[PDB]
């Protein structure tokens, strides 16, 4: 008489095993979707250490990266009030990347990890979640959430990256280690000139190349957020339809 479970152990028992199934099928799910999307647009800067520049990369990755996090948020927090939306997505990605970076970029083709390591996301991802957890509003999240997410990108990457931004002298020319790493480990289709990285303009004043890039990246992410929040909604639709 616990129907349509026979016992409470059967109820609480099933509920528990189902919970896991969901969380797991839902892990990828997103990881799978998020990855394919991210990879097709953010690429590319996330493959190559000699792309991770000062202007482009700290711009495009936050703006393209905020997407599934914002849709993921609109699903957990709306329907379960669970404050791990962004982090659930962001991490899902990071794993799916890393595994493949290792197993394949390295383990299959033997580009060394120092070349093919992914961009760091989890700090911003946490930052986002906690703006939504504290203020219950996605509208606040979209503003101070996505701004934060924008700023923390480069800061939270600096620890991994700085290492390869050390100078080396090479036939009487300067290079960074990264420049060189890419130069060494021959990519059959990756000529510098394709890079999509900072190469300098007359309009740069300062001594600001990164500040402005991370600001811009936050202010835009505000929009990408709103749009992706509501897409996280349509995507949550329990609508049923009549014909196909």
């Amino acid at each position: 008489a616990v129907g349509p479970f026979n016992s409470v152990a059967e109820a609480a028992g099933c509920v528990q095993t189902v919970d896991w199934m969901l969380l797991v099928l839902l892990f990828f799910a997103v990881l799978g979707g998020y990855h394919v999307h991210f990879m097709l647009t953010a690429g590319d800067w996330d493959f190559w250490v000699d792309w991770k520049d000062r202007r482009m990369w700290p711009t495009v990755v936050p703006i393209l990266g905020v997407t599934f996090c914002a849709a993921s948020q609109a699903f957990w927090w709306v329907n379960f009030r669970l404050p791990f939306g962004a982090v659930f997505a962001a991490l899902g990605l990071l794993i799916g990347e890393w595994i493949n970076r290792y197993v394949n970029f390295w383990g299959w083709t033997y580009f060394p990890i120092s070349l093919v390591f992914p961009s760091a996301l989890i700090v911003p991802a946490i930052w986002l979640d906690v703006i939504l957890l504290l203020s219950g509003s996605y509208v606040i999240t979209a503003v101070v959430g996505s701004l934060g997410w924008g700023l923390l990108f480069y800061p939270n990457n600096w620890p991994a990256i700085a290492a390869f931004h050390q100078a080396t002298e090479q036939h009487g020319q300067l290079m960074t280690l990264a420049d060189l790493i890419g130069f060494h480990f021959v990519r059959t289709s990756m000529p510098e000139y394709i890079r999509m990285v900072e190469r300098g303009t007359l309009r740069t004043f300062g001594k600001d190349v990164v500040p402005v890039a991370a600001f811009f990246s936050g202010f835009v992410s505000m929009m990408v957020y709103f749009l992706w929040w509501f897409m996280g909604r349509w995507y949550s639709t329990t609508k049923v339809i009549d014909t196909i």
Binding site: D50, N79, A90, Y110, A120, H165, T168, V186, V197
Partner: protein, 210 residues
């Protein structure tokens, strides 16, 4: 034929044909490369038109140019290695390729390279440690954040709470206080993580390109 670490060199000359097809962009912007399955050989340095060519270069239409590529061996095997040049709006142009044969063990491959400050580093290994060291913590951290709340209010549970009136049964401080704490720590760990990697390597320059 080469040993792992043995410094072979491929070189030659090439003529930029004159009736350069509409199909391919002007070689105004090009890049010299060695056509090999992955980095079976590292490239130590390379030169074209009498210059160090680790970047993009102009070829004028109708001239000839001379080039060479220093190739330290790395991967055990038999690899058909071509001279290769790519063009801005065009693609790869593949040249002569010759079977080169490496022997030894990849295990033994090193470079290395010399920093401006003085020291030496094996590129085949340098930095890889710090990456893991900063990434994998954070990845665990993220996965911790998830596990925590997943076992603290179920999916079904919390969906049903949200579903009936409430909600607020699911969240509500000190759920918030957890957040504020975890958040504050995170900003701190980052401030720290930044300040340290700022002391380690206080040199640093932007990627060199153009």
């Amino acid at each position: 034929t080469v040993n792992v670490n043995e410094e072979m060199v491929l070189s030659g000359k090439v003529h930029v044909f004159s009736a350069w097809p509409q199909a391919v962009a002007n070689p105004r912007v090009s890049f010299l490369n060695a056509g090999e399955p992955g980095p079976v050989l590292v490239r130590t340095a390379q030169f074209i038109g009498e210059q160090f060519a680790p970047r993009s270069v102009s070829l004028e239409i109708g001239k000839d140019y001379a080039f060479s590529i220093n190739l330290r061996g790395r991967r055990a095997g038999r690899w058909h290695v071509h001279a290769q040049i790519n063009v801005e709006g065009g693609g790869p142009i593949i040249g002569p390729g010759q079977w080169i044969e490496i022997k030894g063990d990849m295990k033994d491959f090193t470079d290395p390279v010399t920093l401006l400050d003085g020291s030496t580093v094996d590129l085949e290994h340098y930095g890889i440690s710090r990456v893991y060291a900063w990434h994998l913590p954070w990845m665990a951290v993220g996965a911790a954040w998830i596990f925590f709340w997943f076992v603290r209010k179920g999916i079904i549970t919390s969906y049903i709470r949200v579903a009936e009136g409430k909600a607020d049964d699911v969240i509500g401080d000190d759920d918030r206080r957890i957040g504020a704490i975890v958040l504050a720590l995170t900003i701190l760990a980052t401030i720290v993580g930044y300040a340290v990697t700022n002391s380690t390597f206080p040199r640093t320059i932007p990627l060199q390109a153009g």
